[PDB]
């Protein structure tokens, strides 16, 4: 049973250590979701600060990888920050060597290749994280690319990750079946954020205060996260209609 401890094949052609790394990915009990506007890419994630001794401003699973790229992580924070540091190093190096900003999809591929290596080389363990990369790419426009512990990645019209990803996913699928377009047809990112929060509320059947969420927005030439107060203003607009 040592084929269970390291990344070698089981007799059914499976990699158990990879499968168990996916299981670690839900250990924070956080759900996240990402959607695309006409001009922007929005990512939201639940925020849970279960201890009063914590400084809540330091509790985050959203990362500013470069000027243009944001990353939300589903998984434990040590592995999340390992991935974040590496992604930051890769994006900076890419710009130095090739003279232009690393695209969201290329960074996702690169991080996915690194992950592939941990599934084939025995001395390295997979990271127990799923990485959702967002930007407004200069060639491809609003972009969502997500990586997992198998070294798989793909681009998304929208996506969700966490213990309740299925509910959010089906909710999002239902909306897009209706609208028949690959994105939220909204001018302003404020409204795309409101859409994103609204559909998370429907899908999880729970309400949010301003401290229950984390929001990241990508626009042309920048990614930024919202303060509790920008989020409050979002929540207020949702309630008043």
Partner 1 sequence: TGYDLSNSVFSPDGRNFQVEYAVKAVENGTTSIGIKCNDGVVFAVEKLITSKLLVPQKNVKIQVVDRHIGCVYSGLIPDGRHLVNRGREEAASFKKLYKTPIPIPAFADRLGQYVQAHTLYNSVRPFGVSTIFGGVDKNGAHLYMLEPSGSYWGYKGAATGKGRQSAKAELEKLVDHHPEGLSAREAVKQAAKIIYLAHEDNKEKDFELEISWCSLSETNGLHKFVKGDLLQEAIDFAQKEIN
Partner 2 sequence: TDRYSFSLTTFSPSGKLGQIDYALTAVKQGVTSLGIKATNGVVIATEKKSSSPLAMSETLSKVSLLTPDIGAVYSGMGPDYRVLVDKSRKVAHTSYKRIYGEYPPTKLLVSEVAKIMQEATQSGGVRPFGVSLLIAGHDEFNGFSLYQVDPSGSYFPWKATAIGKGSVAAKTFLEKRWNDELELEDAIHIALLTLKESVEGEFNGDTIELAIIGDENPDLLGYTGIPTDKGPRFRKLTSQEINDRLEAL
Partner 3 sequence: GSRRYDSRTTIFSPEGRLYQVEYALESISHAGTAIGIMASDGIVLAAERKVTSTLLEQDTSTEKLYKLNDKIAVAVAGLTADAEILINTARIHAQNYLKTYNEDIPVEILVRRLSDIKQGYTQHGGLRPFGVSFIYAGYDDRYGYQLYTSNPSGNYTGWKAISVGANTSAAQTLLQMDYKDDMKVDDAIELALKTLSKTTDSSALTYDRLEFATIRKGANDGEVYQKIFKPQEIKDILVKTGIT
Q: Counting every residue, how long is the chain?
A: 241
Q: Report the alpha-carbon distance of residue 237 to residue 186 in Å, rounded.
A: 15
Positive/negative CA dihedral, 228, 48, 235, 80: positive
**Position among 4, 5, 14, 23 found at the interface with partner 2 (CB under 8 A):** 14
Burial of 191 (0-12, 13-18, 19+ CB in 10 A): middle
Residue 34 C-beta: closest distance to partner 1, Å: 23
CB of 116 to partner 1, least distance (A): 16
Q: Is 122 helix (H, G, I), strand (E, B) or coil?
A: coil
Site track for partner 1 across 35-54, x = CB under 8 A: -----------------xxx
Partners of 78 in the β-ladder = none
83 phi, psi to nearest 5 deg? -60, -40
# chain residues binding partner 3, by CB under 8 A: 5
Check binding of 82 to partner 1 (CB under 8 A). Answer: yes
Does residue 11 bind partner 2 (CB under 8 A)? Answer: yes
Q: Tell me which H or E stretch contains 33.
A: strand 32-36
Element (H, E) at 144: strand 141-147
Contact (Cβ atoms closer than 8 angstroms) between residue 226 and residue 196: no
> Widest CA span of the chain, in angstroms?
58
In this chain, which stretch among 39-47, 92-100, 152-160, 217-225 interacts with partner 2, using CB under 8 A? Answer: 152-160
Which one of 6-14, 22-30, 45-53, 186-194 is the stretch in contact with partner 2 (CB under 8 A)?
6-14
58 is a contact residue toward partner 1 (CB under 8 A) = yes
Helix axes 189-204, 228-239, angle to 10 degrees: 70
**Cβ distance to partner 1 smaller for residue 53 or 239:** 53
Under the binding rule (CB under 8 A), the answer on residue 11 touching partner 3 is: no
Residues engaged in binding partner 2 (CB under 8 A): 6-14, 105, 109, 112-113, 115-117, 119-123, 145, 150-152, 154-159, 169, 172-173, 176, 182
Binding residues for partner 3 (CB under 8 A)? 2, 5-6, 122-123
Instruction: Give the footprint of partner 1 on this chain (CB under 8 A).
Output: 1, 4-6, 16-17, 20-27, 52-55, 57-59, 76-79, 81-82, 85, 123-126, 128
């Amino acid at each position: 049973g040592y084929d269970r401890h390291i990344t070698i094949f089981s007799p059914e052609g499976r990699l158990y250590q990879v499968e168990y790394a996916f299981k670690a990915t839900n250990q924070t009990n956080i759900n996240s979701l990402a959607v695309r506007g006409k001009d922007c890419t929005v990512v939201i994630s639940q925020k849970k600060v279960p201890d009063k001794l914590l400084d809540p401003t330091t509790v985050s699973y959203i990362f500013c990888i470069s000027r243009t790229i944001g990353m939300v992580v589903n998984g434990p924070i040590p592995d999340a920050r390992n991935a974040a540091l590496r992604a930051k190093a890769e994006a900076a190096e890419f710009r130095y060597k090739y003279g232009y900003d690393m695209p969201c999809d290329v960074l996702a591929k690169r991080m996915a290749n690194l992950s592939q290596i941990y599934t084939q080389r025995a001395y390295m363990r997979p990271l127990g994280v799923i990485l959702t990369f967002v930007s407004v790419d200069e060639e491809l426009g609003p972009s969502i690319y997500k990586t997992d512990p198998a070294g798989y990645y793909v681009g998304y019209k929208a996506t969700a990750t966490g213990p309740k990803q299925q509910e959010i996913t089906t909710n999002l699928e239902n909306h897009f079946k209706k609208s028949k377009i690959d994105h939220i047809n909204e001018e302003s990112w404020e409204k795309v954020v409101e859409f994103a929060i609204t559909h998370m509320i429907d899908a999880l059947g729970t309400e949010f205060s301003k401290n229950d969420l984390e929001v990241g927005v990508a626009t042309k030439d920048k990614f930024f996260t919202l303060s509790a107060e920008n989020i409050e203003e979002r929540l207020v607009a949702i309630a008043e209609q």
